[PDB]
Amino acid sequence: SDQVPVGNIPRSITVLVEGENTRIAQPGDHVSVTGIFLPILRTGLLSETYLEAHRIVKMDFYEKLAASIAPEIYGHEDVKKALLLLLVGGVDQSPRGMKIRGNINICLMGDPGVAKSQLLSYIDRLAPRSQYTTGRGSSGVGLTAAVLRTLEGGALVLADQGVCCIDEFDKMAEADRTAIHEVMEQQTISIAKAGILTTLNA
Amino acid sequence: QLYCDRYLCDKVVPGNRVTIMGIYSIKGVGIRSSYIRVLGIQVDTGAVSPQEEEEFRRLAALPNVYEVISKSIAPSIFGGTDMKKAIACLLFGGSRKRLPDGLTRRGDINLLMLGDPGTAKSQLLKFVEKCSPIGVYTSGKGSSAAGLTASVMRDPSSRNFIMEGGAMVLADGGVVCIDEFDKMREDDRVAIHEAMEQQTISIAKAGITTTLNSRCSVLAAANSVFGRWDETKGEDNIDFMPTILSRFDMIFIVKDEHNEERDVMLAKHVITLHVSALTQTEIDLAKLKKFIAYCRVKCGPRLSAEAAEKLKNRYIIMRSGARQHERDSDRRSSIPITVRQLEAIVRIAEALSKMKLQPFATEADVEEALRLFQVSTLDAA
Amino acid sequence: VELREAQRDYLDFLDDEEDQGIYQSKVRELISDNQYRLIVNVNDLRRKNEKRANRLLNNAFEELVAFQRALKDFVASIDATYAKQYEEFYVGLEGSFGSKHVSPRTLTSCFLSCVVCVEGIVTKCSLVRPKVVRSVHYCPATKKTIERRYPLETEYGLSVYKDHQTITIQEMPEKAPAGQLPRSVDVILDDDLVDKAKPGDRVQVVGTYRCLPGYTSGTFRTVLIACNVKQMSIAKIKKFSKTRSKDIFDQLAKSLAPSIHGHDYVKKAILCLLLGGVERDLENGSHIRGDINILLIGDPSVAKSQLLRYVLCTAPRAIPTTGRGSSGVGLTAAVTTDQETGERRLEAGAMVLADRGVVCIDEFDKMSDMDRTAIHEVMEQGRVTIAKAGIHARLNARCSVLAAANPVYGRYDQYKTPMENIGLQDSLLSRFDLLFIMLDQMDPEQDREISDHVLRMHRYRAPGEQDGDAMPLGMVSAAFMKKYIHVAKIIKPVLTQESATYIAEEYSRLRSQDSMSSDTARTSPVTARTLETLIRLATAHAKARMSKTVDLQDAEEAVELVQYAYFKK
DNA sequence: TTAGAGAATTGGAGAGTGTGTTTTTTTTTTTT
DNA sequence: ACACACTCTCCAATTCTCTAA
Ligand SMILES: Nc1ncnc2c1ncn2[C@@H]1O[C@H](COP(=O)(O)OP(=O)(O)NP(=O)(O)O)[C@@H](O)[C@H]1O
Ligand SMILES: Nc1ncnc2c1ncn2[C@@H]1O[C@H](COP(=O)(O)OP(=O)(O)NP(=O)(O)O)[C@@H](O)[C@H]1O
Ligand SMILES: [Mg+2]
Ligand SMILES: [Mg+2]
């Protein structure tokens, strides 16, 4: 996106992988590709092109750790410890199906314009696997997965073995509330590709 | 279906009434389509001939032309001479201006009639639509926001989105008559606030963004909230919001009156109008139509210095009186006095000067302009 | 076979070293930059050879090929090795064309095969893709090869291709005839001309008007094969800024929008919006917003709309919008089916086209809240997230928003607080930098000068117009103002310890005063966003001085402005 | 009596010709 | 560029007839 000139839409290119080069690349991953640029064979004089890939290259302790969380922010000593334990987590007890889950979940209520944005973004930056979203239901993809013309996306999906953060939660809709309710109970979701009842980890 | 060729191209547009001369020919197993090849076109309704200019110069020269034109407007309708005079000024209009720092001033005039049932409001609208060189007539109850200004829709061919013009676009340069004005929804009357003042329509939909022109006059008719005007309830007869009442150059209140002499005169007038439908076997409508177009394209006035000085001194008094009335009252009024009213009087002064083809407006013209505004808006306020 | 003499004419025209040597110098420059097209000025050609010049414009094709061959021979005579690097050379035209200057409306079938000069506004583009001119095949078993122009196997490195693109030009809407919609024409861009224009650009295209074939219905489509494409949009500024006799920012603000009387602080804030602040980035990956947003609220007839229509005319890359006439899809981006290639792709909306510019929203209080949800992300972060037509993308929409609205009940009520009169949500009201309230206080002392000024304005007539005319349907000077603002947009000034200290201490004082104050006496609370606003405004004032430092004067001006905006009844 | 050569009729192996081919704005009823 | 439907031609297989082994 930062390479696009002012007031323009970004472009894309098709890359064909063959032989021992397969299974290197992944969705959403930065790569540098060596290849040959060629036109597609018909079956007009204007023709589509692609890149033929030849190489793909990817681009005490408790008090100390508590004090290490968000040092830019004054006070809020025990809130930092709560967030520390949110990152550490409890234990899934699993006694023969009478389940108690170990994941901590917490909520912050903020006065208008208060410092919570700095703390939230610090935990977002700190955590080794995490995602962010906002409750207003913006023009992009939602909390759950979505379909395009295969299935993709979703903040609840992209954070899986980690923690997901919701901003301005109070502006959520009923769809969002039911999705959060389902994640809290079953930690999985459902989106219909084409009427089929597909389901997906969260 | 018609075919058009060489010098006949872009000679007409939709909605026009025309007479066509051409060849008629063809273009289940046995069906074939058919069409007409045009060889001549006549618009049933062109550049003015020299003789016609001499007659229009004579009409502009002769001294009591204002009364002559006033009698030509809606000649069947009994009474209402002040209302007919205001309609004349609406048809001629003020003058457009572009200022040195690039901003514009609108020139043209908006008018509203409000009051009792059975007082010939709809008849006057029905006449002005035929008298104006360009005009359109629509009902407020039967129209939508996207239909008044402009619309966006998919092409019946191809797959692309295309633009369409509403009533205020088709009547660009002319008059728009909105009947049953008090029966529109609030969110639909909001849609014309740009068009009535800035004379342009801004669109941003479906991946297209453009600006269209709408340089037209609005003429409207309405009832009181209570069906007819109730003098015991005062200002509650009106419920239009101030942001639209301030966009009219003049507002008239019409009340029915039960005087015996007028009733006898009006009754005789009506009966003889009906009786003379067989017996029937100052300027005509056709002549007036061409005269209006000629005056609008050739003449553009300005104020004389002393006329501006007089109007300035009057406006201060007018603002002071309105302020004192609101201060004395427990309630704020629905018809405000603002700089838009100062501009309104100037536009009427220019129209009065235009009827006589004179380059400058004068104190006599400003006197008549102030008289017309004094009757309508100050009776409404 | 006179064209061999016509080519001979062009070759001796190009060989101008015997007479001041301008075109030989230009060809030498072309060689040095490794280019393969030349731009010729038709005035020179007309001066040297009237017959050849007046024939060129009416026989575009047969004459331009001779000119191209003459250029190829001339560059070969200078350097044969360079001449062999490219297949063929091209020539473009500039100057005054007289009767051939047209628009998409006035262009008609009698112009076919003339050189024409069309102008208008660009509305769309197709994607760049290659076209074949010469194809080659080879056989390694026999050392054999074959060619064709427009067994063995194809030689992509011995074959050669060139780029191709289509765009569309539309008539200027200000010039449309009464009661009609604008007309448009299709332009073809080829080889080194591709992607030289994008939507919303005002362009002037030179080219040859030509039909395209299409049993036949005897009916064709016409397109403009472009030949050249053009776009349109120091000592004085140095001595002016060096004077230092007066506060220049006050003089520039006073001179803003001369038609409109009063409203000093609003003019000063609009000038700060035009100049802008500056960006900054932090080592953690965070960044500070440099652009400014402004909101206006007030009664009828207080010139709110006119200020918007003025900024739109005196700022580069500015866009209009009205609350009732626009949709969230239209504001951001919409999916489009291409008729040239058949493919589905996005098309830019109003806030994307205003990237690195200004967007004016009139009648802001009539929008449905669903559209305001789209505006929220744009105003906060300058990006817009889209998930349509197989694309998941984060587009760039960096812009300053200037917006106007009217209060609830139409006329402002003195007996209610500002938050009661104002119809918007407190969350949205926290995003704008400054919020101004405007009221029609009916004082006769003020009405005197206002009415006088308006009446002076209505008696003016332009000097190029005569005593009784009417138009057809269809203090600092403005020029210096544009140039001074344009140069001032480069300076990038920097904080000083004294200004930082002043802002910090004054913000603490202001916070204490606000803590003492109540919602009955203020528009909104004061927080860190107030510090960001103060920093942006002080930066902009320093920028107007072109002083590389942000000085105490800038900080003092900035705090006075926000003090007036927040703490007056 | 059994079998091969020269002349006449007929089948079909083969070639040539003609033709077809999700994603946005606006209205209306009834649910709120 | 790649499949049906139709029209048409020339080559040589099958039988009649006369003859020798
Ligand atoms: N002065 C008049 N001269 C002639 N006919 C008149 C006059 N006043 C009223 N009428 C008659 O009144 C009838 C109704 O006319 P109309 O134009 O609808 O009046 P109106 O004020 O619009 N009535 P309404 O629509 O109920 O408000 C027609 O039959 C007219 O002929
Ligand atoms: N100080 C002023 N200087 C010049 N013109 C003024 C001034 N005050 C009012 N006007 C006039 O006010 C008219 C209407 O301007 P406009 O910008 O629409 O006002 P507004 O505040 O936007 N009212 P509205 O659009 O109904 O909310 C213009 O024609 C101006 O000539
Ligand atoms: Mg009626
Ligand atoms: Mg306005």
PDB file of C-alpha atoms in Angstrom, chain C residues 276-413:
ATOM      1  CA  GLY C 276      -1.789  22.232   7.004  1.00  0.00           C
ATOM      2  CA  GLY C 277       0.418  20.922   9.830  1.00  0.00           C
ATOM      3  CA  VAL C 278       3.141  18.258   9.463  1.00  0.00           C
ATOM      4  CA  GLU C 279       3.390  14.482   9.960  1.00  0.00           C
ATOM      5  CA  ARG C 280       5.663  12.725  12.457  1.00  0.00           C
ATOM      6  CA  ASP C 281       6.552   9.044  13.045  1.00  0.00           C
ATOM      7  CA  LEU C 282       7.643   7.157  16.187  1.00  0.00           C
ATOM      8  CA  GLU C 283      10.145   4.291  16.573  1.00  0.00           C
ATOM      9  CA  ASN C 284       7.354   1.956  17.813  1.00  0.00           C
ATOM     10  CA  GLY C 285       5.642   2.319  14.380  1.00  0.00           C
ATOM     11  CA  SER C 286       3.008   4.885  15.471  1.00  0.00           C
ATOM     12  CA  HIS C 287       2.432   8.209  13.657  1.00  0.00           C
ATOM     13  CA  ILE C 288       0.826  11.634  14.244  1.00  0.00           C
ATOM     14  CA  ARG C 289      -1.905  13.004  11.922  1.00  0.00           C
ATOM     15  CA  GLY C 290      -0.832  16.171  10.036  1.00  0.00           C
ATOM     16  CA  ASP C 291      -4.102  17.230   8.325  1.00  0.00           C
ATOM     17  CA  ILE C 292      -6.803  19.452   9.952  1.00  0.00           C
ATOM     18  CA  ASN C 293     -10.642  19.108  10.043  1.00  0.00           C
ATOM     19  CA  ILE C 294     -13.103  22.019  10.634  1.00  0.00           C
ATOM     20  CA  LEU C 295     -16.891  22.219  11.307  1.00  0.00           C
ATOM     21  CA  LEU C 296     -19.299  25.195  10.962  1.00  0.00           C
ATOM     22  CA  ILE C 297     -22.791  25.456  12.547  1.00  0.00           C
ATOM     23  CA  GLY C 298     -25.202  28.385  12.277  1.00  0.00           C
ATOM     24  CA  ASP C 299     -28.470  30.136  11.329  1.00  0.00           C
ATOM     25  CA  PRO C 300     -29.811  30.815   7.810  1.00  0.00           C
ATOM     26  CA  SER C 301     -28.158  33.523   5.681  1.00  0.00           C
ATOM     27  CA  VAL C 302     -24.761  33.756   7.428  1.00  0.00           C
ATOM     28  CA  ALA C 303     -22.639  32.835   4.353  1.00  0.00           C
ATOM     29  CA  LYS C 304     -21.759  29.267   5.436  1.00  0.00           C
ATOM     30  CA  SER C 305     -22.278  27.818   1.935  1.00  0.00           C
ATOM     31  CA  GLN C 306     -20.334  30.600   0.180  1.00  0.00           C
ATOM     32  CA  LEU C 307     -17.159  29.923   2.202  1.00  0.00           C
ATOM     33  CA  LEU C 308     -17.273  26.287   1.061  1.00  0.00           C
ATOM     34  CA  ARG C 309     -17.789  27.293  -2.575  1.00  0.00           C
ATOM     35  CA  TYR C 310     -14.780  29.655  -2.250  1.00  0.00           C
ATOM     36  CA  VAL C 311     -12.285  27.134  -0.765  1.00  0.00           C
ATOM     37  CA  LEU C 312     -13.232  24.699  -3.538  1.00  0.00           C
ATOM     38  CA  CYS C 313     -12.034  27.289  -6.117  1.00  0.00           C
ATOM     39  CA  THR C 314      -8.797  28.413  -4.370  1.00  0.00           C
ATOM     40  CA  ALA C 315      -7.196  25.062  -3.314  1.00  0.00           C
ATOM     41  CA  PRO C 316      -5.528  22.270  -5.379  1.00  0.00           C
ATOM     42  CA  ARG C 317      -7.334  18.884  -5.616  1.00  0.00           C
ATOM     43  CA  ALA C 318     -10.598  19.849  -3.858  1.00  0.00           C
ATOM     44  CA  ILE C 319     -13.938  17.915  -4.063  1.00  0.00           C
ATOM     45  CA  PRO C 320     -17.623  18.886  -3.261  1.00  0.00           C
ATOM     46  CA  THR C 321     -20.287  16.744  -1.550  1.00  0.00           C
ATOM     47  CA  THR C 322     -23.775  17.291  -0.036  1.00  0.00           C
ATOM     48  CA  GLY C 323     -25.306  15.257   2.785  1.00  0.00           C
ATOM     49  CA  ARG C 324     -28.600  14.335   1.080  1.00  0.00           C
ATOM     50  CA  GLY C 325     -27.122  13.601  -2.381  1.00  0.00           C
ATOM     51  CA  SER C 326     -24.433  10.984  -1.577  1.00  0.00           C
ATOM     52  CA  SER C 327     -23.999   7.361  -0.404  1.00  0.00           C
ATOM     53  CA  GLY C 328     -21.341   5.502   1.607  1.00  0.00           C
ATOM     54  CA  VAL C 329     -20.425   3.470  -1.481  1.00  0.00           C
ATOM     55  CA  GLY C 330     -20.054   6.703  -3.453  1.00  0.00           C
ATOM     56  CA  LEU C 331     -17.894   8.200  -0.696  1.00  0.00           C
ATOM     57  CA  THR C 332     -15.417   5.253  -0.585  1.00  0.00           C
ATOM     58  CA  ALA C 333     -15.286   2.836  -3.614  1.00  0.00           C
ATOM     59  CA  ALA C 334     -17.613   0.848  -5.946  1.00  0.00           C
ATOM     60  CA  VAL C 335     -17.217  -2.372  -7.986  1.00  0.00           C
ATOM     61  CA  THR C 336     -17.213  -1.909 -11.790  1.00  0.00           C
ATOM     62  CA  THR C 337     -17.450  -4.300 -14.778  1.00  0.00           C
ATOM     63  CA  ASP C 338     -14.935  -3.316 -17.482  1.00  0.00           C
ATOM     64  CA  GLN C 339     -16.365  -3.391 -21.031  1.00  0.00           C
ATOM     65  CA  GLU C 340     -12.891  -3.427 -22.665  1.00  0.00           C
ATOM     66  CA  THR C 341     -11.545  -6.554 -20.872  1.00  0.00           C
ATOM     67  CA  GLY C 342     -14.715  -7.990 -19.222  1.00  0.00           C
ATOM     68  CA  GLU C 343     -13.054  -7.976 -15.756  1.00  0.00           C
ATOM     69  CA  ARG C 344     -14.403  -6.781 -12.352  1.00  0.00           C
ATOM     70  CA  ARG C 345     -12.436  -4.070 -10.488  1.00  0.00           C
ATOM     71  CA  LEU C 346     -12.814  -1.184  -8.012  1.00  0.00           C
ATOM     72  CA  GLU C 347     -13.431   2.493  -8.856  1.00  0.00           C
ATOM     73  CA  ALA C 348     -12.465   5.402  -6.589  1.00  0.00           C
ATOM     74  CA  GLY C 349     -15.046   7.352  -4.557  1.00  0.00           C
ATOM     75  CA  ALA C 350     -15.066  10.982  -3.392  1.00  0.00           C
ATOM     76  CA  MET C 351     -12.828  10.623  -0.306  1.00  0.00           C
ATOM     77  CA  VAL C 352     -10.224   8.524  -2.182  1.00  0.00           C
ATOM     78  CA  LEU C 353      -9.966  11.051  -5.044  1.00  0.00           C
ATOM     79  CA  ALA C 354      -9.343  13.796  -2.441  1.00  0.00           C
ATOM     80  CA  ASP C 355      -6.088  12.046  -1.337  1.00  0.00           C
ATOM     81  CA  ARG C 356      -3.519  14.704  -0.286  1.00  0.00           C
ATOM     82  CA  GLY C 357      -6.302  17.311  -0.744  1.00  0.00           C
ATOM     83  CA  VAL C 358      -9.528  18.838   0.696  1.00  0.00           C
ATOM     84  CA  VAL C 359     -13.144  17.576   0.689  1.00  0.00           C
ATOM     85  CA  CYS C 360     -16.085  19.930   1.356  1.00  0.00           C
ATOM     86  CA  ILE C 361     -19.272  18.437   2.875  1.00  0.00           C
ATOM     87  CA  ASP C 362     -22.255  20.796   2.736  1.00  0.00           C
ATOM     88  CA  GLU C 363     -25.548  20.030   4.524  1.00  0.00           C
ATOM     89  CA  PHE C 364     -23.712  17.607   6.855  1.00  0.00           C
ATOM     90  CA  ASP C 365     -26.623  17.228   9.312  1.00  0.00           C
ATOM     91  CA  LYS C 366     -28.883  15.528   6.693  1.00  0.00           C
ATOM     92  CA  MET C 367     -26.685  12.404   6.268  1.00  0.00           C
ATOM     93  CA  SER C 368     -27.889   9.006   7.434  1.00  0.00           C
ATOM     94  CA  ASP C 369     -25.694   7.722  10.267  1.00  0.00           C
ATOM     95  CA  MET C 370     -24.646   4.676   8.197  1.00  0.00           C
ATOM     96  CA  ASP C 371     -22.633   7.047   5.971  1.00  0.00           C
ATOM     97  CA  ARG C 372     -21.047   8.640   9.041  1.00  0.00           C
ATOM     98  CA  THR C 373     -19.729   5.175   9.939  1.00  0.00           C
ATOM     99  CA  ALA C 374     -17.776   5.274   6.656  1.00  0.00           C
ATOM    100  CA  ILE C 375     -16.494   8.800   7.364  1.00  0.00           C
ATOM    101  CA  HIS C 376     -15.235   7.781  10.846  1.00  0.00           C
ATOM    102  CA  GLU C 377     -12.347   5.546   9.688  1.00  0.00           C
ATOM    103  CA  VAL C 378     -11.258   8.067   7.016  1.00  0.00           C
ATOM    104  CA  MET C 379     -11.152  11.026   9.418  1.00  0.00           C
ATOM    105  CA  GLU C 380      -9.364   9.112  12.187  1.00  0.00           C
ATOM    106  CA  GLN C 381      -6.704   7.103  10.296  1.00  0.00           C
ATOM    107  CA  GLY C 382      -6.569   8.430   6.694  1.00  0.00           C
ATOM    108  CA  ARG C 383      -7.067   4.895   5.272  1.00  0.00           C
ATOM    109  CA  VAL C 384     -10.193   3.007   4.141  1.00  0.00           C
ATOM    110  CA  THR C 385     -10.570  -0.798   4.337  1.00  0.00           C
ATOM    111  CA  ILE C 386     -12.385  -2.606   1.476  1.00  0.00           C
ATOM    112  CA  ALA C 387     -13.270  -6.318   1.013  1.00  0.00           C
ATOM    113  CA  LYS C 388     -14.993  -6.630  -2.427  1.00  0.00           C
ATOM    114  CA  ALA C 389     -14.501  -8.034  -5.969  1.00  0.00           C
ATOM    115  CA  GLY C 390     -11.892 -10.556  -4.785  1.00  0.00           C
ATOM    116  CA  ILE C 391      -9.683  -7.785  -3.317  1.00  0.00           C
ATOM    117  CA  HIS C 392      -8.898  -7.215   0.377  1.00  0.00           C
ATOM    118  CA  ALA C 393      -7.135  -3.846   0.499  1.00  0.00           C
ATOM    119  CA  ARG C 394      -6.245  -0.793   2.602  1.00  0.00           C
ATOM    120  CA  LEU C 395      -6.594   2.223   0.275  1.00  0.00           C
ATOM    121  CA  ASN C 396      -5.101   5.709   0.813  1.00  0.00           C
ATOM    122  CA  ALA C 397      -7.548   8.568   1.511  1.00  0.00           C
ATOM    123  CA  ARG C 398      -5.498  11.254   3.331  1.00  0.00           C
ATOM    124  CA  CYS C 399      -7.632  14.422   3.276  1.00  0.00           C
ATOM    125  CA  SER C 400      -8.833  17.439   5.262  1.00  0.00           C
ATOM    126  CA  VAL C 401     -12.603  17.685   5.810  1.00  0.00           C
ATOM    127  CA  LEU C 402     -14.349  21.075   5.902  1.00  0.00           C
ATOM    128  CA  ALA C 403     -18.040  20.686   6.809  1.00  0.00           C
ATOM    129  CA  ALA C 404     -21.101  22.883   7.430  1.00  0.00           C
ATOM    130  CA  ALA C 405     -24.465  22.213   9.108  1.00  0.00           C
ATOM    131  CA  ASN C 406     -27.576  23.975  10.555  1.00  0.00           C
ATOM    132  CA  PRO C 407     -28.790  23.603  14.187  1.00  0.00           C
ATOM    133  CA  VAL C 408     -31.812  21.654  15.415  1.00  0.00           C
ATOM    134  CA  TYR C 409     -35.144  23.555  15.105  1.00  0.00           C
ATOM    135  CA  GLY C 410     -33.583  25.531  12.185  1.00  0.00           C
ATOM    136  CA  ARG C 411     -32.897  28.674  14.255  1.00  0.00           C
ATOM    137  CA  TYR C 412     -30.429  28.443  17.159  1.00  0.00           C
ATOM    138  CA  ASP C 413     -32.003  28.712  20.652  1.00  0.00           C
TER     139      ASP C 413
END
